[PDB]
Amino acid sequence: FYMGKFHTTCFEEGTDDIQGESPAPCGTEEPARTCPNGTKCQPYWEGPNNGITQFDNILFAVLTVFQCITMEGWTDLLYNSNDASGNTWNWLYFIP
Amino acid sequence: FRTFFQALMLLFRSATGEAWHNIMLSCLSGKPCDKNSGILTRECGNEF
Amino acid sequence: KFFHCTDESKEFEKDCRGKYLLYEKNEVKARDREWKKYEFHYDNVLWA
Amino acid sequence: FFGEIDPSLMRHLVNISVYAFNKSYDYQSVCEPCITEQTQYFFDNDSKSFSGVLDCGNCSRIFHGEKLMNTNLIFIMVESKGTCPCDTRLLIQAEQTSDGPNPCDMVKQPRYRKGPDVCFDNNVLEDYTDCGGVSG
Amino acid sequence: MQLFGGQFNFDEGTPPTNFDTFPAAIMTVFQILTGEDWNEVMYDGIKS
Amino acid sequence: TASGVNQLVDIYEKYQDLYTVEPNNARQLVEIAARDIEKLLSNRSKALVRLALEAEKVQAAHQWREDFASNEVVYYNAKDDLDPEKEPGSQRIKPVFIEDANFGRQISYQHAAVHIPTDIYEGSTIVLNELNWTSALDEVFKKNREEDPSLLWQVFGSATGLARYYPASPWVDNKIDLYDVRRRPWYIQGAASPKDMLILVDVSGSVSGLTLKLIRTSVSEMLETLSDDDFVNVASFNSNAQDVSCFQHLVQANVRNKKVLKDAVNNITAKGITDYKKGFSFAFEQLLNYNVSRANCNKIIMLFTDGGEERAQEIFNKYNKDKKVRVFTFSVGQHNYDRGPIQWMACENKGYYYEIPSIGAIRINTQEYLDVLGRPMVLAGDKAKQVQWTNVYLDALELGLVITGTLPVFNITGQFENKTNLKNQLILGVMGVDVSLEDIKRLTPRFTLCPNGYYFAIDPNGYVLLHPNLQPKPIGVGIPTINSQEPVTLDFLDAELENDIKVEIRNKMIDGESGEKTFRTLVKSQDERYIDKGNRTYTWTPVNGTDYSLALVLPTYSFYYIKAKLEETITQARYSETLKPDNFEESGYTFIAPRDYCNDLKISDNNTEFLLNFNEFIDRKTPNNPSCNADLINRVLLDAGFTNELVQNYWSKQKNIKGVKARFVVTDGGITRVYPKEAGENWQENPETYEDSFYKRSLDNDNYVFTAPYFNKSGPGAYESGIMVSKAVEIYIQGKLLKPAVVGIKIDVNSWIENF
Numbered sequence A: 001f002y003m004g005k006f007h008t009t010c011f012e013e014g015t016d017d018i019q020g021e022s023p024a025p026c027g028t029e030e031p032a033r034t035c036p037n038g039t040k041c042q043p044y045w046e047g048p049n050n051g052i053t054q055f056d057n058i059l060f061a062v063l064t065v066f067q068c069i070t071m072e073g074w075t076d077l078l079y080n081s082n083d084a085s086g087n088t089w090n091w092l093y094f095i096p
Numbered sequence B: 001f002r003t004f005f006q007a008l009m010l011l012f013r014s015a016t017g018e019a020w021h022n023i024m025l026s027c028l029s030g031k032p033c034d035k036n037s038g039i040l041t042r043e044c045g046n047e048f
Numbered sequence C: 001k002f003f004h005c006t007d008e009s010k011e012f013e014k015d016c017r018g019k020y021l022l023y024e025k026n027e028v029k030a031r032d033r034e035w036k037k038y039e040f041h042y043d044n045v046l047w048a
Numbered sequence D: 001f002f003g004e005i006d007p008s009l010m011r012h013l014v015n016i017s018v019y020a021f022n023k024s025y026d027y028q029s030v031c032e033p034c035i036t037e038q039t040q041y042f043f044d045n046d047s048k049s050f051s052g053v054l055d056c057g058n059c060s061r062i063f064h065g066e067k068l069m070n071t072n073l074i075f076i077m078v079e080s081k082g083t084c085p086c087d088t089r090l091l092i093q094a095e096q097t098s099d100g101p102n103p104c105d106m107v108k109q110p111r112y113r114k115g116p117d118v119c120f121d122n123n124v125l126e127d128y129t130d131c132g133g134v135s136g
Numbered sequence E: 001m002q003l004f005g006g007q008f009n010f011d012e013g014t015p016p017t018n019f020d021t022f023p024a025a026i027m028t029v030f031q032i033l034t035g036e037d038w039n040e041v042m043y044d045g046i047k048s
Numbered sequence F: 001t002a003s004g005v006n007q008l009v010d011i012y013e014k015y016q017d018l019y020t021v022e023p024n025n026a027r028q029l030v031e032i033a034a035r036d037i038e039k040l041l042s043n044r045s046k047a048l049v050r051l052a053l054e055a056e057k058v059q060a061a062h063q064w065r066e067d068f069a070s071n072e073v074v075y076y077n078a079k080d081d082l083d084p085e086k087e088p089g090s091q092r093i094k095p096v097f098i099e100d101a102n103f104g105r106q107i108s109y110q111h112a113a114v115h116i117p118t119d120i121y122e123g124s125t126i127v128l129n130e131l132n133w134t135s136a137l138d139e140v141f142k143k144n145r146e147e148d149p150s151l152l153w154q155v156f157g158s159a160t161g162l163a164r165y166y167p168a169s170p171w172v173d174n175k176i177d178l179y180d181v182r183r184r185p186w187y188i189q190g191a192a193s194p195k196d197m198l199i200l201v202d203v204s205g206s207v208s209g210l211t212l213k214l215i216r217t218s219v220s221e222m223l224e225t226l227s228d229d230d231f232v233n234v235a236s237f238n239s240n241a242q243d244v245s246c247f248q249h250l251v252q253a254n255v256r257n258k259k260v261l262k263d264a265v266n267n268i269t270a271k272g273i274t275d276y277k278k279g280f281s282f283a284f285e286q287l288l289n290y291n292v293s294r295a296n297c298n299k300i301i302m303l304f305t306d307g308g309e310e311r312a313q314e315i316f317n318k319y320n321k322d323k324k325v326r327v328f329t330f331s332v333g334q335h336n337y338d339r340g341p342i343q344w345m346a347c348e349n350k351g352y353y354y355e356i357p358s359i360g361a362i363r364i365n366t367q368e369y370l371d372v373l374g375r376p377m378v379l380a381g382d383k384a385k386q387v388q389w390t391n392v393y394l395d396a397l398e399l400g401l402v403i404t405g406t407l408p409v410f411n412i413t414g415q416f417e418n419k420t421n422l423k424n425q426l427i428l429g430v431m432g433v434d435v436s437l438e439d440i441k442r443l444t445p446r447f448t449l450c451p452n453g454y455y456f457a458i459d460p461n462g463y464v465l466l467h468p469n470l471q472p473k474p475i476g477v478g479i480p481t482i483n484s485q486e487p488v489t490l491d492f493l494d495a496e497l498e499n500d501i502k503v504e505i506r507n508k509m510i511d512g513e514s515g516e517k518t519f520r521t522l523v524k525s526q527d528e529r530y531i532d533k534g535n536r537t538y539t540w541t542p543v544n545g546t547d548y549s550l551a552l553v554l555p556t557y558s559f560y561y562i563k564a565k566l567e568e569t570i571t572q573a574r575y576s577e578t579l580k581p582d583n584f585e586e587s588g589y590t591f592i593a594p595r596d597y598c599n600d601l602k603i604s605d606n607n608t609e610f611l612l613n614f615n616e617f618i619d620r621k622t623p624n625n626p627s628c629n630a631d632l633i634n635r636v637l638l639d640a641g642f643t644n645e646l647v648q649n650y651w652s653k654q655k656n657i658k659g660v661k662a663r664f665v666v667t668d669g670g671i672t673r674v675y676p677k678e679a680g681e682n683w684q685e686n687p688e689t690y691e692d693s694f695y696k697r698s699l700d701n702d703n704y705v706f707t708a709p710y711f712n713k714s715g716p717g718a719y720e721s722g723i724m725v726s727k728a729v730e731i732y733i734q735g736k737l738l739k740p741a742v743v744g745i746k747i748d749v750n751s752w753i754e755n756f
């Protein structure tokens, strides 16, 4: 479900620059988070937690899952995935 | 706390303990109210 | 002892007055100086 | 400028001393993306008949140059541009953005200056107790 | 201390949880045992 | 034939007796101008002296209050909103700003305005006492302005941060006020003496990370507090000391040497094990190098480190045992290391110890060593109080190119009775008055000279105080990297074309000598595309009283000028009816130079407006009136008459010629006339006659000059205006030689391409 979803953010329209000091995952559709007037959703950004927390490899996914098992930082993933994909179904992955 | 389901998620995040103490402080008195809440002054939240 | 000023340099209530310069990345902002208590402290047995 | 039109006859004219150049620096100049280099060309030998043979790659261009005496005008007659191909290194007279002179060399040979003669740098009565360590 | 010695001198600053000294290493290890913000310390160790 | 060249000469002889030829004795002209500048600067210095005396006395009589109840100090804070419609001990003033064309801003002459920078709180006990005792300065400010109504600014930069300048004007205009009066070049100039600073940067491993960024920022900010009289070199040491940049000994703090040092500092990396005995032995040896030029006083070492364990007593006992070198130690960064040894280094060696834990402390902790450096001059008594003038720099309040005279203010409480001297060895602040370069330019008139003659002034460093080639723009320092506080320091050799003889003339001016030097030089044209080989005469004299030297450049033909006659009221009307706006149809479209003829006549950038104003003024009252310049008006009217007689009697006979598009005439008085009325719209030259490149080029040439048109420009090219050829008018009156005008034509391209 979550492979590579967290690499897009609110880049400035004119330049390849992050809009704010704290970026968040974005989307091009209404259910996902939408960029403001001055920005657009561009392809590549490192990701949350400097790219350490993600689902890109099976190794990255296993480490990411183990972090949620310890109940430490799991809500940040829930909110990030909600920004990328909408909050309709993401609670079905994390609550179980 | 806006909806029943948004409330349950808050009580599940706190049950696991994700920064529940900061949520408690955010709910205290003297917080801005919603635009459509019908209250035009910064009188929201409780010491409860 | 759980008191702080938003400006790091000022370490007393009288000094913590006025405005100070906050140096963020590639931008300088002027912010007010406030003498405020920490969120969780020990000022009485109930707060402890 | 003739350098940006025919960039071979121009440099040959400079070389055989038809013209002369003398380059300076502009420090109060504005740039688009600043010190700026400037170049100006002027008559040097101030003699009239200037004829020679310009050499292109595997071809020769023969030219004659004559100068009007009552005006600052030169009539330069070159055989042909297309016949003999020379390398087209444009000679631009316009002002070019540049770094100034290398500071290292200038400070090896500094310009003459006379510094102030009065200086108050020591006094026996001075109190050095305010060192700053015990004061905080 | 051996794995993460003077490696926590980041440009922003040295985190309070670092392994530079033995008193600092014990309290950083103790925090990971209690499992509070163990992931945040992991990010610094990976970043270093 | 097309542009009358013999006709103007004949006109100039045949209308003799309407003007006289007067000499330009360069020796007298330069001395008159030098004494005028001396009197101006002495007038400016008297105000500083009386401000310093009054401030010292008033502070000495002050009583240190510690509590202020409601309104107790009344002052106008210069950064306050004018309409708040609404403090601990202060009551604001609501001032009325009317206008002043002398300043350009809106000012109030009623009281002084206070600037308190952003960091410093205005309710402090040390700020309220300043705001009280400094309120006595307003009477002296008013007295200075009333004695000399030409004073621009009178600031009192205070050691606490606040500044009081007399004409109360709002502070300038993101937009975060970072101004601090204690870092401006005039304050730094007046607060200490020239230094020989050697920054010693620690680049061992332990300073890696945040400490390194703080160190680089601190070193840059320290470099910003250095003048051209100061010499600086930056070294670094992990285990062996080395120079950070290509410089090896010591370099004066130019705007460019400082850039090289800053760039070298911004590219250092931290790796190694600290060795203090090898860095200090390097600093002390570079402070002993006397093969190079240096300030030769105030030898100081600034150590930027974090903390250590070695104090290195042997190095200090070996190199600095008579204590001729101060040592300032900085403990940069947020860390936990031993700080005792670096405090001991400052304590032993007549220095001070500073701490920079974050970016916000850099400015304050890098500007404070001047307090230490000012002790010996405070103890010098009434002998360190000399007025000193700064480099040319752009004013903070948008006033243009100004220089500032400074005078330190001492603390003398408990001096009448022998009570206190411990804290009295610190200046209260620095006085300062601004004189604009336009004042100095007013004191050196240039309209009795040819367009090729000018004045210029040199300070001991060789920079220009006056030059035609000095523009109100900051000095460029290098190529502008992709993605108003510096002085405008332009050397004489960088303002002109360097020459072997010029390098000698400049040295003689710096030494403070006077002489003449006639020689064949190489002058560059106004438009910066040509060079002429002119013969010029440099006459210079020292501005006695100050350190400046004035010089006057004059070509050979500019030794005489035309002085117009009084004539009579009949001739004034007949000459002035020629330049009527409706009348340049039979006379040719006329321009007039925007030179100030009267105080009331206002200069405009649109020559039609100025010409209308000039015409209506001449119509009003009489051409000769008080509050005007009789010579300028008479010269302009004479030139108008000569030009009108030319254009009518000659050009009106031949309306059209085969090979010309427009005939023009430019004369010294100020008048430009192009014969075809339709051709006036194509005339792109400056209405000021003394600023036309072709006029200046044609003056240096005894033959015809072809001025090439511009290529790929928005204006009409060489197809609708033509190609300009100009010839200078040369008249022989008595035995004298004069060149009062230049005529020419714009040859149409089509006729000449057909004739070619």
Ligand SMILES: *[C@@H]1O[C@H](CO)[C@@H](O[C@@H]2O[C@H](CO)[C@@H](O[C@@H]3O[C@H](CO)[C@@H](O[C@@H]4O[C@H](CO)[C@@H](O)[C@H](O)[C@H]4NC(C)=O)[C@H](O)[C@H]3NC(C)=O)[C@H](O)[C@H]2NC(C)=O)[C@H](O)[C@H]1NC(C)=O
Pocket: F064, F065, F066, F411, F412, F413, F414, F420, F421, F422, F423, F424, F428
């Ligand atoms: C020019 O020099 C003169 C003297 O050379 C100088 O006048 C002196 O100014 C100081 C202010 O710094 C006055 O200080 C007195 O000292 C007491 C005792 O310290 C202070 O009371 C407390 O002091 C502590 C530090 O010890 C400090 O926290 C704070 O200053 C005070 N705290 C509290 C809670 O009160 C007072 O500051 C002050 N006492 C009184 C009764 O005012 C000296 O009194 C001044 N000396 C004289 C002879 O008047 C003057 O400031 C110099 N000029 C400038 C511009 O600074």
Ligand SMILES: *[C@@H]1O[C@H](CO)[C@@H](O[C@@H]2O[C@H](CO)[C@@H](O[C@@H]3O[C@H](CO)[C@@H](O)[C@H](O)[C@H]3NC(C)=O)[C@H](O)[C@H]2NC(C)=O)[C@H](O)[C@H]1NC(C)=O
Pocket: F058, F072, F132, F133, F134, F135, F136
């Ligand atoms: C520093 O602040 C002080 C407190 O405001 C000022 O001292 C006060 O100045 C007043 C003048 O406006 C004095 O009022 C006059 O004092 C004379 C004494 O000879 C008396 O007649 C009256 O009290 C009064 N007269 C009139 C006609 O107003 C205050 O006495 C005096 N002292 C106080 C209030 O304690 C200082 O002036 C100020 N420093 C500076 C440099 O302005």
Ligand SMILES: *[C@@H]1O[C@H](CO)[C@@H](O[C@@H]2O[C@H](CO)[C@@H](O)[C@H](O)[C@H]2NC(C)=O)[C@H](O)[C@H]1NC(C)=O
Pocket: D020, D021, D022, D023, D044, F498, F522
């Ligand atoms: C500046 O222009 C002058 C004028 O030509 C140059 O000086 C001459 O240089 C040539 C060689 O290029 C010599 O043969 C002449 O003897 C020089 N003339 C004099 C009077 O010395 C000069 O080289 C140019 N450049 C600089 C930097 O001065």
Ligand SMILES: *[C@@H]1O[C@H](CO)[C@@H](O[C@@H]2O[C@H](CO)[C@@H](O)[C@H](O)[C@H]2NC(C)=O)[C@H](O)[C@H]1NC(C)=O
Pocket: F289, F290, F291
């Ligand atoms: C330049 O400074 C050095 C020392 O800083 C002076 O020392 C001399 O250096 C030259 C180099 O070969 C030699 O004569 C000796 O090594 C030194 N002579 C001494 C110490 O008497 C040097 O004299 C200075 N330069 C000049 C020209 O005096």
Ligand SMILES: *[C@@H]1O[C@H](CO)[C@@H](O[C@@H]2O[C@H](CO)[C@@H](O)[C@H](O)[C@H]2NC(C)=O)[C@H](O)[C@H]1NC(C)=O
Pocket: F031, F034, F035, F038, F541, F542, F543, F544, F545
């Ligand atoms: C500075 O002072 C000198 C002398 O003190 C002035 O020069 C003198 O000028 C008079 C005539 O004006 C001569 O008779 C003297 O011989 C000169 N003295 C010298 C040259 O030592 C000089 O004029 C003063 N400066 C200015 C700008 O006037």
Ligand SMILES: CC(C)CCC[C@@H](C)[C@H]1CC[C@H]2[C@@H]3CC=C4C[C@@H](O)CC[C@]4(C)[C@H]3CC[C@]12C
Pocket: B029, B046, B047, B048
């Ligand atoms: C079982 C619970 C209700 C009993 C405990 C009572 C105490 C701890 C709580 C419950 C209800 C609370 C009150 C509810 C509402 C307000 C209004 C608020 O603007 C000020 C505080 C005040 C007055 C609270 C004070 C603390 C309070 C009295």
Ligand SMILES: *[C@@H]1O[C@H](CO)[C@@H](O)[C@H](O)[C@H]1NC(C)=O
Pocket: A037
């Ligand atoms: C921002 O985007 C919305 C989307 O339609 C648009 O209506 C609005 O005008 C935009 N705002 C600006 C300032 O362009």
Ligand SMILES: *[C@@H]1O[C@H](CO)[C@@H](O)[C@H](O)[C@H]1NC(C)=O
Pocket: F036, F039, F040, F043, F147, F148
């Ligand atoms: C100097 O000041 C006096 C009076 O203050 C004035 O008359 C004189 O013209 C001034 N000289 C100048 C400004 O050169």
Ligand SMILES: [Ca+2]
Pocket: A071, A072, A073, B017, B018, B019, E035, E036, E037
């Ligand atoms: Ca937790």
Ligand SMILES: [Ca+2]
Pocket: A071, B016, B017, E035, E036
């Ligand atoms: Ca937990």
Ligand SMILES: [Ca+2]
Pocket: F204, F205, F206, F207, F273, F274
């Ligand atoms: Ca070290």
